[PDB]
Motif scaffolding. Sequence first.
Motif, PDB file in Angstrom:
ATOM      1  N   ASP A   1       0.804  -0.969   0.418  1.00 22.80           N
ATOM      2  CA  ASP A   1       0.178   0.477  -0.002  1.00 22.80           C
ATOM      3  C   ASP A   1       0.705   1.235  -0.085  1.00 22.80           C
ATOM      4  N   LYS A   2       2.067   1.637   0.847  1.00 23.77           N
ATOM      5  CA  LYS A   2       3.158   2.438   0.420  1.00 23.77           C
ATOM      6  C   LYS A   2       4.380   1.743   0.469  1.00 23.77           C
ATOM      7  N   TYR A   3       4.631   0.818   0.280  1.00 26.22           N
ATOM      8  CA  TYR A   3       6.311   1.258   0.420  1.00 26.22           C
ATOM      9  C   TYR A   3       6.870  -0.091  -1.239  1.00 26.22           C
ATOM     10  N   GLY A   4       6.081  -1.260  -0.674  1.00 24.36           N
ATOM     11  CA  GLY A   4       6.620  -2.189  -1.524  1.00 24.36           C
ATOM     12  C   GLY A   4       6.923  -3.984  -0.647  1.00 24.36           C
ATOM     13  N   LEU A   5       7.236  -4.950  -1.098  1.00 21.04           N
ATOM     14  CA  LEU A   5       7.670  -6.661  -0.176  1.00 21.04           C
ATOM     15  C   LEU A   5       9.265  -5.579   0.160  1.00 21.04           C
ATOM     16  N   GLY A   6       9.117  -6.414   1.321  1.00 19.09           N
ATOM     17  CA  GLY A   6      10.201  -6.436   2.111  1.00 19.09           C
ATOM     18  C   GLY A   6      10.131  -8.276   2.258  1.00 19.09           C
ATOM     19  N   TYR A   7      12.315  -8.611   1.962  1.00 18.48           N
ATOM     20  CA  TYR A   7      11.831  -9.692   2.924  1.00 18.48           C
ATOM     21  C   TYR A   7      13.063 -10.610   3.126  1.00 18.48           C
ATOM     22  N   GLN A   8      13.299 -11.562   3.925  1.00 23.63           N
ATOM     23  CA  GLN A   8      15.141 -12.431   3.748  1.00 23.63           C
ATOM     24  C   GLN A   8      15.091 -12.981   2.803  1.00 23.63           C
ATOM     25  N   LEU A   9      16.348 -13.604   3.117  1.00 20.21           N
ATOM     26  CA  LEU A   9      16.710 -14.685   2.548  1.00 20.21           C
ATOM     27  C   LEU A   9      16.952 -15.744   3.437  1.00 20.21           C
ATOM     28  N   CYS A  10      17.159 -17.420   2.739  1.00 21.11           N
ATOM     29  CA  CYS A  10      17.514 -18.068   3.832  1.00 21.11           C
ATOM     30  C   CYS A  10      19.435 -17.767   4.539  1.00 21.11           C
ATOM     31  N   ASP A  11      20.293 -16.976   3.567  1.00 17.53           N
ATOM     32  CA  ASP A  11      21.337 -16.508   4.063  1.00 17.53           C
ATOM     33  C   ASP A  11      21.341 -15.124   4.425  1.00 17.53           C
ATOM     34  N   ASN A  12      20.596 -14.893   4.849  1.00 20.58           N
ATOM     35  CA  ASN A  12      20.332 -13.480   6.097  1.00 20.58           C
ATOM     36  C   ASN A  12      20.614 -11.735   5.084  1.00 20.58           C
ATOM     37  N   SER A  13      20.151 -11.900   4.182  1.00 22.87           N
ATOM     38  CA  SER A  13      20.561 -10.969   2.980  1.00 22.87           C
ATOM     39  C   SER A  13      19.167 -10.732   3.235  1.00 22.87           C
ATOM     40  N   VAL A  14      18.926  -9.081   3.004  1.00 21.80           N
ATOM     41  CA  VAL A  14      17.081  -8.332   2.847  1.00 21.80           C
ATOM     42  C   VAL A  14      17.366  -7.932   1.669  1.00 21.80           C
ATOM     43  N   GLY A  15      16.026  -8.151   1.313  1.00 18.45           N
ATOM     44  CA  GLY A  15      15.863  -7.504   0.070  1.00 18.45           C
ATOM     45  C   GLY A  15      14.115  -6.529  -0.168  1.00 18.45           C
ATOM     46  N   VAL A  16      14.363  -5.480  -0.949  1.00 17.55           N
ATOM     47  CA  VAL A  16      12.799  -4.749  -0.849  1.00 17.55           C
ATOM     48  C   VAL A  16      12.431  -4.757  -2.132  1.00 17.55           C
ATOM     49  N   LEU A  17      11.124  -5.035  -3.097  1.00 18.35           N
ATOM     50  CA  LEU A  17      10.959  -4.751  -4.337  1.00 18.35           C
ATOM     51  C   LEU A  17       9.797  -3.811  -3.673  1.00 18.35           C
ATOM     52  N   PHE A  18      10.245  -2.393  -4.067  1.00 20.64           N
ATOM     53  CA  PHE A  18       9.380  -1.156  -4.419  1.00 20.64           C
ATOM     54  C   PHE A  18       8.254  -1.197  -5.257  1.00 20.64           C
ATOM     55  N   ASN A  19       7.835  -0.337  -4.694  1.00 16.36           N
ATOM     56  CA  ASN A  19       6.221  -0.172  -5.761  1.00 16.36           C
ATOM     57  C   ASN A  19       6.073   0.391  -6.973  1.00 16.36           C
ATOM     58  N   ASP A  20       7.400   1.109  -7.242  1.00 17.54           N
ATOM     59  CA  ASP A  20       7.954   1.257  -8.603  1.00 17.54           C
ATOM     60  C   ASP A  20       8.557   0.991  -9.784  1.00 17.54           C
ATOM     61  N   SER A  21       9.096  -0.287  -9.172  1.00 18.30           N
ATOM     62  CA  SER A  21       9.327  -1.810  -9.432  1.00 18.30           C
ATOM     63  C   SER A  21      10.992  -1.396  -9.371  1.00 18.30           C
ATOM     64  N   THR A  22      11.655  -0.910  -8.591  1.00 13.31           N
ATOM     65  CA  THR A  22      13.260  -0.733  -8.737  1.00 13.31           C
ATOM     66  C   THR A  22      13.813  -2.064  -7.331  1.00 13.31           C
ATOM     67  N   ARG A  23      14.823  -2.344  -7.071  1.00 18.24           N
ATOM     68  CA  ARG A  23      14.743  -3.494  -6.362  1.00 18.24           C
ATOM     69  C   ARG A  23      16.299  -3.111  -5.078  1.00 18.24           C
ATOM     70  N   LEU A  24      16.551  -3.081  -3.840  1.00 21.54           N
ATOM     71  CA  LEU A  24      17.588  -2.611  -3.534  1.00 21.54           C
ATOM     72  C   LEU A  24      18.075  -4.043  -2.691  1.00 21.54           C
ATOM     73  N   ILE A  25      18.733  -4.398  -2.392  1.00 24.95           N
ATOM     74  CA  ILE A  25      18.911  -5.778  -1.752  1.00 24.95           C
ATOM     75  C   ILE A  25      20.514  -5.514  -0.976  1.00 24.95           C
ATOM     76  N   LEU A  26      20.450  -5.458   0.842  1.00 26.72           N
ATOM     77  CA  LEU A  26      21.663  -5.558   1.463  1.00 26.72           C
ATOM     78  C   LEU A  26      21.973  -6.974   1.595  1.00 26.72           C
ATOM     79  N   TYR A  27      23.854  -6.881   1.324  1.00 26.62           N
ATOM     80  CA  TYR A  27      23.560  -8.313   1.684  1.00 26.62           C
ATOM     81  C   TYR A  27      23.800  -8.719   2.967  1.00 26.62           C
TER      82      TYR A  27
END
Length: 210
Positions: free
Chosen positions: A47-73
């Motif tokens: 509704d505001k920002y997008g979908l945040g997630y953690q992968l099993c290796d502890n990295s985290v990502g966000v798929l933002f509503n503008d269709s950009t992605r940011l991933i933190l290793y």
Amino acid sequence: HLSDMLQQLHSVNASKPSERGLVRQEEAEDPACIPIFWVSKWVDYSDKYGLGYQLCDNSVGVLFNDSTRLILYNDGDSLQYIERDGTESYLTVSSHPNSLMKKITLLKYFRNYMSEHLLKAGANILPYLRTWFRTRSAIILHLSNGSVQINFFQDHTKLILCPLMAAVTYIDEKRDFRTYRLSLLEEYGCCKELASRLRYARTMVDKLLS
């Protein structure tokens, strides 16, 4: 690869795996086909920002509503930013363009929220999120390496599918997990719990393709 997963699922389900004369689900076990990556936590704030997630290796990502992605290793400092045209850039938290301050801040709120509040799926066991959706019964997650993950809301059961290995991992309601080769499920069958879930998976893969 998604089309291949659809044909694989179809071939298993058409063989009617739970209706075989003697189903031998154990013959299809292949513990070495365990996936390298799956989604261990997620937060839908679309509704505001997008979908945040953690992968099993502890990295985290966000798929933002503008269709950009940011991933933190998993290192806590390395970032990968993917623009809408797929262009990738590589920066660090400790030195990053001011232009990504807002997105890094949001990723941080997602990261803190998942760490403080949510349980790690597969904790007993780099792609990015390509797309996702939710139905009444499940969330469907499609990663850039072709993995498709489906988490069932009603009983906490999950499937992780990989068409490259043509395999499926099933996490049951006790968090026991087992990985099966789909070609061996086609041959030897499987019990009703898995068969049912694979029929639903096929329908979801159809949705991802539309």
